[PDB]
Automatic annotation (TrEMBL):
<dbReference type="InterPro" id="IPR012347">
    <property type="entry name" value="Ferritin-like"/>
</dbReference>
<feature type="domain" description="Iminophenyl-pyruvate dimer synthase">
    <location>
        <begin position="13"/>
        <end position="213"/>
    </location>
</feature>
<protein>
    <recommendedName>
        <fullName>Iminophenyl-pyruvate dimer synthase domain-containing protein</fullName>
    </recommendedName>
</protein>
<dbReference type="Pfam" id="PF12902">
    <property type="entry name" value="Ferritin-like"/>
</dbReference>
<dbReference type="InterPro" id="IPR026820">
    <property type="entry name" value="VioB/RebD_dom"/>
</dbReference>
């Protein structure tokens, strides 16, 4: 069994949260591109976005139980780079199926829906043995990443402390309240919720997105350019989003380090969605940094 060090476990916690966070602006950007919010793909994506946010919280709770407070910074959307995922590891390479695809932000189009299918691609389809070494940074699927994380978590369960900088924004709190082996067992449950929601063990993200990919009639989407003119309302809409997103990550950083949720939290949040929609309405693709 490959031996994990505490620093590497911490690096993997940070990696998992970076990947979950990376999906949020991606999915949100697609979501708000859809003109009609009553449509099936809109409601499917919205629920998925909310689950990603929950995943981020759960990862923070697990990491914090092991003594690490994660920190968030604005993700980047360039080329075909997805944090910590290498599809070249998988057989068949699912980019041969879900193509075209891109890490660049865009509306509900084939390129974006294909990418969403790729992100949530189930570990069982990769046909690979999980690479459990603590120096691995790239995996073939999210599920494989979480498989490796469970190994480090088990080996280092002596570090688990209950009620340690836990966050919770019928069911008990989805937090680690116990120490040592008991808290490790709670942490494992939180990992299971994360993975079950993405790829399946109601309706997992992969299946949801593959459903959208297969539909005959996609809803109308806003049109936008990635680089609106200097001076323009659309550029200023982007600037507002960049600022509000920065502020929202500052709020989360405090929370992930054991701070209380400020009154600015529910206020800050839904505002982001208004900011993203406003970009699209002005003909500017949402931008987050």
């Amino acid at each position: 069994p490959p031996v994990w060090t505490l620093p590497r476990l911490y690096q993997h916690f940070q990696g998992a949260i970076d990947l979950e966070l990376w999906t949020i602006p991606y999915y949100l950007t697609v979501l708000y591109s859809i003109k009609d919010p009553t449509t099936v793909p809109y409601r499917l994506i919205q629920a998925a976005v909310y689950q990603e946010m929950l995943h981020a919280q759960l990862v923070s709770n697990i990491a914090n139980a092991y003594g690490y407070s994660p920190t968030l910074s604005a993700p980047e959307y360039v080329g075909t780079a997805v944090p910590h995922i290498d599809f070249d590891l998988d057989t068949p390479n699912p980019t041969s199926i879900f193509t075209p695809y891109s890490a660049e932000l865009g509306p509900l189009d084939l390129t974006r829906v294909n990418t969403m299918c790729l992100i949530e691609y189930p570990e069982w389809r990769t046909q690979r043995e999980p690479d459990l070494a603590d120096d691995v940074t790239d995996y073939g699927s999210i599920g494989e990443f979480y498989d490796a994380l469970r190994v480090g978590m088990e080996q280092l369960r002596g570090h688990v402390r209950g009620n340690q900088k836990q966050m919770d924004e019928n069911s008990p709190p989805l937090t680690v309240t116990e120490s040592g082996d008991a808290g490790f067992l709670q942490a494992l449950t939180l990992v299971d919720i994360i993975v079950d929601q993405g790829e399946g063990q109601a309706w997992p993200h992969f299946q949801r997105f593959d459903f959208i990919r297969r539909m005959p009639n996609w809803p109308g989407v806003y049109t936008g350019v990635t680089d609106p003119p200097a001076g323009s309302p659309g550029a200023e809409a982007q600037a507002r989003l960049i600022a509000d997103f920065a502020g929202f990550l500052d709020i989360l950083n405090g929370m992930f380090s054991g701070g209380g949720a400020p009154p600015a939290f529910g206020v800050q949040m839904a505002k982001l969605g208004g900011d993203i929609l406003s970009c699209w309405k002005l003909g500017a693709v949402p931008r987050y940094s």
